[PDB]
């Protein structure tokens, strides 16, 4: 498990790292723990939290892409084809760094 996105995410300041990694864990966990709830599979690119606290942060959007999200015009979508396994892998990597 050697993620370029997670390594980049860890290069942020402690404060920003915490803020962004927290959001990333929530996006992952909501899908992992509610796999039949479609509402957790799409994130609006213009959502205030997402656009201001996640997207501007080096490494963070790439963590979503490595999890399996795809970028549409207005949303990032976790598609039907995407494995929980790859999603879980990135969640686990980020959580280690938050405990670290």
């Amino acid at each position: 498990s050697a993620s370029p996105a997670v390594a980049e995410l860890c290069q942020n300041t402690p404060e920003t790292f915490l803020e962004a990694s927290k959001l990333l864990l929530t996006y992952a966990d909501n899908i992992l723990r509610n796999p039949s709830d479609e509402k957790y599979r799409s994130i609006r690119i213009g959502n205030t939290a997402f656009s201001t606290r996640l997207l501007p942060v080096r490494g963070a959007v790439e963590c979503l892409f490595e999890m399996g999200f795809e970028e549409g015009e207005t949303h990032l979508i976790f598609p039907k084809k995407a494995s929980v396994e790859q999603l879980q892998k990135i969640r686990d990597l980020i959580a280690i760094e938050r405990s670290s």
């Binding site: 929530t26 996006y27 509402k39 957790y40 994130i43 609006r44 959502n47 939290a49």
Partner: peptide, 5 residues
């Protein structure tokens, strides 16, 4: 704080 919509 809504993260989705």
């Amino acid at each position: 704080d809504d993260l989705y919509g």
